[PDB]
């Protein structure tokens, strides 16, 4: 079997992408943030604190004839951005782009932090990292991919994120019409539960390529590209007026600037992020100060290849017995 679903930017800045997911019988369709940096499928629900819901579509397990309480299971998660949520767990039928999983753990939110409440376009998350990160206790649960893997024609999923445009998540097959040239595969470490790999280097604009190993994770649930301070300094030094601002929270630059591209290495191959992809607009409405799409990972403890980087490629998450990551231009 296979699945194919369209993923859509939640706003003008591609701050995140939402994908429709069918849950229960009859289907309840919720727009979920597919996150390869986490491993919980959680949703706004009929159980979520009333004052913490503001515009979101909710999952009502009591309206689903195939929902079953997973007795005594609870979950609690916190993300790299400071947000968090928690609640209880049902199993139900979950379908993504025509691909169906029965008995999927659907983690129902009792509580969500203010940033979740504040975003009416995201109805929850669907984790696609390794199941060892799943937060359900006392019985840890499997991600959707993991549950589906057996059924798939090939044990893979692919992320084809758009720049200011819809993209696609495919399950169980590689669409050879979706990328240019060939796919370069690279080794993955599963030891931290992430799709963790090692980039071979970088270039700033038309600059010479710097060969250097940069460990990082492929994280569709993170908006920006977070890299070592050396790398990031080297990038912003090419932008007149760019500065790191502690009051703002990172690098900002003149909104009048034209940004240089950023190239990252995948083995012997190169993925080029166009400069426009690195522009995240005014730090505040009307401001002439713009927020950068490449930021320091110093203080995160890990480098993150977030949407800014992934959307410049066709990315293959290969969940074979020995997982690997593939990158192609498109």
- Give the range of 68-76, 78-86, 150-158, 174-182 binding ligand F63 by CB under 6 A: 78-86
If the CB atoms of residues 38 and 64 are measured against ligand F63, the closer one turns out to be: 38
The answer to the question of residue 81 lying near ligand F63 (CB under 6 A) is yes
146 is catalytic: no
- What does the per-residue mask of binding to ligand F63 show for 4-23, with x meaning CB under 6 A? ------------x-------
Cα 309 versus chain centre, distance:
11
Number of H helices, E strands in the chain: 4, 24
If the CB atoms of residues 33 and 47 are measured against ligand F63, the closer one turns out to be: 33
Q: Within 207-246, which residues bind ligand F63 (CB under 6 A)?
A: 221-222
Q: Which two tokens stand for residue 323?
A: 């997982």
The answer to the question of residue 80 lying near ligand F63 (CB under 6 A) is yes
Quote the Cα angle for 167-170-174, to 5°.
Answer: 110
Q: What's the burial of 238, exposed, middle or buried (CB within 10 Å: 0-12/13-18/19+)?
A: middle
Quote the Cα angle for 10-282-265, to 5°.
Answer: 70
For ligand F63, the binding residue among 37, 172, 250, 326 (CB under 6 A) is 37
Q: If we measure between CA atoms, which residue out of 311, 306, 314, 309 comes closest to residue 223?
A: 306
33 is catalytic: no
Q: Within 147-206, which residues bind ligand F63 (CB under 6 A)?
A: none
The answer to the question of residue 119 lying near ligand F63 (CB under 6 A) is yes
Per the listing, tokens 């727009």 go with: 31
CA distance linking residue 38 with residue 151, whole number of Å: 22
Out of 14, 33, 35, 40, the active site residue is: 35
- Active site residue ranges: 35, 199
- Which residues in this chain contact ligand F63 in the complex, by CB under 6 A? 16, 33, 35, 37-38, 79-81, 83, 115-116, 119, 122, 125, 221-222
């Amino acid at each position: 079997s296979t699945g194919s679903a369209t993923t859509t930017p939640i706003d003008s800045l591609d701050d995140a992408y939402i994908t429709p997911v069918q849950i229960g019988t009859p289907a309840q369709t919720l727009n979920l943030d597919f996150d390869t940096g986490s491993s919980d499928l959680w949703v706004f629900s009929s159980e979520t604190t009333a004052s913490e819901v503001d515009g979101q579509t909710i999952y009502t397990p009591s309206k689903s004839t195939t929902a079953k309480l997973l007795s005594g299971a609870t979950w609690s998660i916190s993300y790299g951005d400071g947000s968090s949520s928690s609640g209880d767990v049902y199993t139900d039928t979950v379908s993504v782009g025509g691909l169906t999983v029965t008995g999927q753990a659907v983690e129902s939110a009792k509580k969500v932090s203010s940033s979740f409440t504040e975003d009416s376009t995201i109805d929850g998350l669907l984790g696609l990292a390794f199941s060892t990160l799943n937060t359900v206790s006392p019985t840890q649960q499997k991600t959707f991919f993991d549950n589906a893997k057996a059924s798939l024609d090939s044990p893979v999923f692919t992320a084809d994120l758009g720049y200011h445009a819809p993209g696609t998540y495919n399950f169980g097959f590689i669409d050879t019409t979706a990328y240019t040239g060939s796919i370069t595969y690279t080794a993955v470490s599963t030891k931290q539960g992430f799709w963790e790999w090692t980039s071979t280097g970088y270039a700033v604009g038309s600059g010479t390529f710097k060969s250097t190993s940069i460990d990082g994770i492929a994280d569709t649930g993170t908006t920006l590209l977070y890299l070592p301070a050396t790398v990031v300094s080297a990038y912003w030094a090419q932008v007149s007026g760019a500065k790191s601002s502690s009051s703002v929270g990172g690098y900002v630059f003149p909104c009048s600037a034209t940004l240089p591209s950023f190239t990252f290495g995948v083995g012997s191959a190169r993925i080029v992020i166009p400069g426009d992809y690195i522009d995240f607009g005014p730090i505040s409405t009307g401001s002439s100060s713009c927020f950068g799409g490449i930021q320091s990972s110093a203080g995160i403890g890990i480098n993150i290849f977030g949407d800014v980087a992934l959307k410049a490629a066709f990315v293959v998450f290969n969940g074979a017995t020995t997982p690997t990551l593939g990158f192609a231009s498109k």
